Amino acid sequence: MRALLPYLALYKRHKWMLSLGIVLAIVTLLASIGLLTLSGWFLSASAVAGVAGLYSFNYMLPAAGVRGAAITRTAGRYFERLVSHDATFRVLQHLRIYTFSKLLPLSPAGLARYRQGELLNRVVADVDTLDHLYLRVISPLVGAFVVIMVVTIGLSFLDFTLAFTLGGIMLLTLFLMPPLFYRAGKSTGQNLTHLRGQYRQQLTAWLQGQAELTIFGASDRYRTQLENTEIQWLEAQRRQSELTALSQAIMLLIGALAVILMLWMASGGVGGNAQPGALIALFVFCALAAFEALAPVTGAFQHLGQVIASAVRITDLTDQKPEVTFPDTQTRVADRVSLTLRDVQFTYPEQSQQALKGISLQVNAGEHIAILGRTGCGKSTLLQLLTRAWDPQQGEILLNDSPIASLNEAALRQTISVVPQRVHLFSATLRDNLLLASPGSSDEALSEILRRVGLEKLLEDAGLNSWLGEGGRQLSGGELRRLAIARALLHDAPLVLLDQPTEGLDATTESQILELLAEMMREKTVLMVTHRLRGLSRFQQIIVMDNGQIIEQGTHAELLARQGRYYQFKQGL
Amino acid sequence: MNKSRQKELTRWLKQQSVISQRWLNISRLLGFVSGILIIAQAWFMARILQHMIMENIPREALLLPFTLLVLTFVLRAWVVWLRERVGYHAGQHIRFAIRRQVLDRLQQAGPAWIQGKPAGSWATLVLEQIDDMHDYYARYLPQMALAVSVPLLIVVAIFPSNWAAALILLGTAPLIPLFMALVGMGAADANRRNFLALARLSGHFLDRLRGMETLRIFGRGEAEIESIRSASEDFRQRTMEVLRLAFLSSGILEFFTSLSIALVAVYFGFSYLGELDFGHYDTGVTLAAGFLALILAPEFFQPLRDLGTFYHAKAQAVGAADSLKTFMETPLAHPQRGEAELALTDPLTIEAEDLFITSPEGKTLAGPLNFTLPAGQRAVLVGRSGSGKSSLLNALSGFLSYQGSLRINGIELRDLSPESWRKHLSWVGQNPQLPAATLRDNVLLARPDASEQELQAALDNAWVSEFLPLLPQGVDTPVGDQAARLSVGQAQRVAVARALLNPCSLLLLDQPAASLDAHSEQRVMEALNAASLRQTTLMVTHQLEDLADWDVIWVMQDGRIIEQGRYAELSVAGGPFATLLAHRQEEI
Ligand SMILES: Nc1ncnc2c1ncn2[C@@H]1O[C@H](COP(=O)(O)OP(=O)(O)OP(=O)(O)O)[C@@H](O)[C@H]1O
Ligand SMILES: Nc1ncnc2c1ncn2[C@@H]1O[C@H](COP(=O)(O)OP(=O)(O)OP(=O)(O)O)[C@@H](O)[C@H]1O
């Protein structure tokens, strides 16, 4: 049960508030027992000598004894649950942040193991099952323990045997039942958690791609498998309900046995006298009422077969090391940046063949180069290595005659801007979907930069307060590319990485975009990865096939002269 | 959420108990039997105690009632077990049925209505909102009659001994409903607001998780934490707000029950002493009546507290039923769901006059299109970006709502029995994604029983087997989350192979040569031309080279078509087409 230890240590910040709960619990349990015990004893003892000889003075037992037990029984309970709950959620939310932080600094190959449909389950629905741990696990046990000892010690003053019998029966039940009801709950909770995660993942995967499923008629199979994986979850829930019902029945039977034993045994005298009188009533009533405190003890321990699984999942999620690591206080931004790649060798994880070997290049003080290649040749892998996603397994990647590693996250992520070939539309306001580049900016530069790229149709009607992405307006296939280009010019930066502009645009729009890009980027350095051989007047042309530079021409002229590669690339094959 | 909305939601929730009233009746009967048994036990215990205390009679003469008390206890335990099991089963059945209905409607909806909310919101609505009605459907409904029935029997059994205690209980009884109806509405509204906040949080988290690459490359590692913190605070506040009302109601009920118990005990204690002597049937008061009343009163009050506890579960169910009821009353694309089959084979012909394709909100994405594709042939759409070509393809597929046009073979497209209609299409899509797990399953998504034509399909579209002897396993490679195992240009060929496996009668080709080099695009184009020559096609190609023998060219922009001609007659002075071709040829 060591999986529950780290999450049980979150008491150093809310110790007093949670301890007040257990104090109030023992107080209200004591009041609840005392009310019935005193009422029974008064009703029994007012009838023996109450007919004549009114010497049992009246105005102490009902007034002080009972009216003081009808308030504490209620006011004790209401303040007990109102405080503790307030603490518990105040912890849970904190966890919901902490895990999220540990999920941030691993985008590539880090979260590629876990399916993205169940990480949401771990974050949301697997942190809401610890409220049982923070509410029911601790307080009932100590409350029942203290109440049982207090009652037994109080009753031991008269006829040790009876009080010892009652206390022993209560202690035996308390120490026996939870260890016996933990067992089946273990397996049932494990199945519950696993099946809930699987069902959520499958349901999420069923959507986000309904179009292809429904066009090709492949939805009935997935629906059938969804129902199949839900049936077992329902069955396990039924098993849990059955176990709970059996627990309640056993509690009732134990209470009946205790009541019967205490009633029958207290006949020959509860302490001498061979005929007690008015004491059997209190002894019966105390046993009758004492088990309402012990009733909820087993429901707290039975449900520990589900909390452990969630704790294990969260612990696994929060204990993964990163793969990059950053230095400190090395920002020192500049205006002119060069680039040097002496040797680069990379092998993707879990793979066995190098996807990028033997690459060397040098870009000097704001050049303009474009690289060409086959459909698959590791050209987008080269770009993603310059933003420190993975770590090269050989060679060096210099930057302005300085190692890339000796640069903190506030600098490498500042003088680098990228335009990836897979754009994402965040479900947020257009003003918030475009302020990622430059958070400060203004509300006027946004319109100006949105008008030159050529959109001119989004800042209308509602305008910059419209809701884009899912749940709102969805952009087309070219507007997405234009928006990706637009949120790469506000960021500025002296080094731009255009992964693949103009993929899904017509001739006129692409021409306008090319003219704009050429005009605005003049003092910077551009590394283009293009498939259209359109307007190649750059200062360096580079071609790749599998790993290395086939020809580093850099003039666009001798390729038309030397009948090598790129000579057949544009004529046709 | 006004009073009328709550009434409508309550009626809708009550509608679904028809298939479980059969077990609700059994639950009510079992509760009634338990209520009888507990009274019997109380009477037995009271008689035993009076005989034991007053007359000092030895145990042996009271050997009879002990066995009856034991039997009553055993019977009570058995009854409670059976009642709990029956209640749970009756609760589960209705949730199963409701989830089946919701999934059916969601499948019938389509891909345009699904994007109305993020997938996280859909998952939360399907799981939590459906699962949170179990308490209402299992506990509250049987208890609504038990809380009326059992106290009446208890007070009736108490009556024939001393009317004062019964009068006290009857006077104390009516106060509870007046004090739960004062917080019911607040609970019912707070529940809905809390559920809305939870759905918002889940959707935000899922959407942020999907696009982590942009956040990393742009360095936004601080604002997202702030947004998550705000969402968590908004969730926590509503949760505390509903729990506070629940606690207050429970405390008030407990206080009143305790006060009534104290009053009854005080009266019975004072009566024996000869101080009050007002309530009796002129025969005094005995210990048996007092003990019986003392034992029975808390059990008289318990069902009312149970009803007060289950009222908040009912409020939770009412609040949860607000989000999934509105969605179940929103019109779909075509609100008829027609029924007709357009035979088989019989080469198609798409003809439309004045077709205005709308949006799932009410906007307009097209204009007065007038066209007719005669008995096969091939059609290409070329024009300025942002005109509505993909909207036309979606309307032809059947994911949007049109207005009075687009009939095929003389039959309107509105009543073609969608399940039968979608069998004649071989979609290719723009920016495709792989929804399966293994690379072999995606290429076999149409006809999953074939092992020889798979190789021919993978070799005809070509260049999908060129990278096959490079993956770790082979044709059974477990592709990544979206497409992480493959690149961008290697998924287009997979989609093309998927679209070319089996014959069809209508081929809606989106842009097939996306992110491809010259050789690969040329081979895929040759394969697609060979496949397309055999039946009706519709292409939205974006390059103005090699279209000399495509039979028809439709230049379209601003959501309408101006020029519908041929390559020879449109390459001389054909307005916008000439300008586009000139730009394309001069830029090279
Ligand atoms: N996440 C990944 N894990 C392992 N291998 C990968 C991953 N992503 C891509 N690859 C491998 O990288 C190789 C191609 O590299 P990359 O994806 O950079 O291609 P590319 O030439 O940039 O393609 P494109 O021009 O279409 O962008 C292939 O062998 C592919 O399987
Ligand atoms: N549901 C919608 N709500 C609002 N606007 C929409 C919706 N769907 C499409 N649009 C808008 O319709 C316009 C053009 O329609 P559509 O999206 O079909 O463009 P398109 O012709 O397919 O463009 P392209 O093929 O060049 O990417 C765009 O401005 C797009 O944002």
Numbering used by the authors:
A (entry chain C): 1 to 573
B (entry chain A): 1 to 588
The authors write:
CydDC is a prokaryotic ATP-binding cassette (ABC) transporter required for heme assembling in respiratory cytochrome bd oxidase, a promising target for drug discovery. In our structures, CydC and CydD form a heterodimer with each subunit composed of one transmembrane domain (TMD) and one nucleotide-binding domain (NBD). TM4 and TM5 of one subunit associate with TM1-3 and TM6 of another to form a helix bundle in a “domain swapping” manner. The overall fold of CydDC belongs to the type IV family of ABC transporters, commonly known as exporters.
